[PDB]
């Protein structure tokens, strides 16, 4: 393309980093990436379980059979009649290409799998090594932009500490600029004809929770303090449709920090910890109480009903075999006192359980016996406990509690990642796009683990491809 005014990308999470990379590298369209925070990455850079793909090279290598049709089936089942089915079709159909894009353009291995809740087969990809998938992916995409910037400053600029506050439109009805507050709190306008909102969810915002899901306002969150629904609000005021805003995902397993127990913010206990073999024990009885691998709305409901009203937490207990397949991650959690390695005898006392050690042993064994029926219907039992586990055998334990995690609602988009006008199927503006958690309609009533990083890549690429047709 001939260089004109920049495309403004709002937010440097995976949706924004995807959109920017695709614009600059495929089309040589100039980008200005604005983020109101002090650093790149949003909640994306903190993501720990991985990114979904159906029918990938990694699945083939590991002899997992998966299709876009099965992924779509799991996604429609998760959605429970909410959202836009054709966007779920797109999300799942283009996921093979998403994983391939990360592997071929950025040499991300993505060679390991985990099966998360609501998934029929393992399709959540992560790379072997020390780096969790959120950080590995953000790091690689940001490094590419920074390299490109250093060679051609006009092709991409990243501007941090820049909070977008509005979009300016001409008489009817085109984008002419982006209004933002710079590092010094001064109003600035970035002149532009194309803007992509990649500004994330609203899960941290107590006021938006009061408006859309009032019964969640006292729950802790995994979200960073930047997660305040800015783009949703800005776009709704400009006349965009919002959809499914009252669909807020509460993740069942945020870690409790033993030295800061009532912190409103929690580290997340990656769902892979359960997918790869971890179980949940009741915090008083020391006994399993539910299917740990169902969808997040269902596991959370079980914890909130079966664990004590006051003191609503559970014990996440992981075997040596879980540790061997998730070593670096668990080592990290241990470094933050979030997981402790303990003998079964000490587990009983350190967590004030009613069960005897010998009784807990009997339980772990029958859970691990996969020739014995599972009390709670768990669809996948791998890396369970040693058959001759004794009271002095060690396990890994963390304390977990439900947390506000993800907002499925947001601005309505179409298949081109264009923002849809309120009460209409026409676009609000030829130059307004959105991608990632700021958008609504992709997940419906519940998001499958692994599909939010996926959404970022699929719809970020889409926004870039479609701006390229118009630029
Ligand atoms: C602990 C945690 C763990 C997670 N683990 C996984 C996982 O394992 N697998 C998976 O698929 N997903 C996971 N997710 C969700 C996922 O990682 C992303 O958060 C999600 O995909 C949204 O990405 P995003 O690009 O839309 O938004 P974000 O990554 O949140 O980035 C949005 C950016 O927009 C900036 N911004 C916000 N408002 C403005 C404004 N007015 N002006 C300018 N900039 C603004 C923000 O500062 C932020 O940097 C996890 C999320 C969290 C919090
Ligand atoms: C396995 C693993 C899981 C992590 N989980 C979270 C998390 O849930 N929430 C979060 O904010 N950061 C998470 N992080 C990020 C760390 O808090 C930290 O930002 C990162 O390790 C960078 O190290 P630093 O503190 O020296 O900057 C995780 C990191 C790893 C390696």
Numbering used by the authors: 31 to 501
Passage from the reporting paper:
In order to test the first hypothesis, we added an excess amount of FAD right before crystallization. The crystal we obtained diffracted to 1.75 Å and the structure was solved by molecular replacement. The shape of the electron density map appeared to be similar to flavin mononucleotide (FMN), showing a clear isoalloxazine ring and one phosphate group. The adenine nucleotide moiety of FAD, which was not anchored in this second flavin-binding pocket, could not be detected in the electron density map due to its flexibility. The second FAD-binding pocket was well defined, possessing a deep cavity containing enough space to accommodate the isoalloxazine ring from FAD. Six amino acid residues, including W295, F297, L298, N359, F362, and Y363, from the clamp domain and three amino acid residues, including K76, S78, and P162, from the flavin domain of Osm1 formed the binding pocket of the isoalloxazine ring from FAD. Among these nine residues, P162, W295, F297, F362, and Y363 directly interact with FAD via hydrophobic interactions, whereas L298 forms a hydrogen bond with FAD using a nitrogen from the main chain. With respect to the catalytic mechanism, FAD bound in the second FAD-binding pocket may directly transfer electrons to cofactor FAD because of the lack of a barrier between the two FAD molecules. Moreover, the edge-to-edge distance between cofactor FAD and the second FAD molecule was around 4 Å, sufficiently close enough for direct electron transfer. Taken together, we confirmed that Osm1 can oxidize free riboflavin molecules by accommodating them in the second FAD-binding pocket, which allows electron transfer between cofactor FAD and free FADH2.
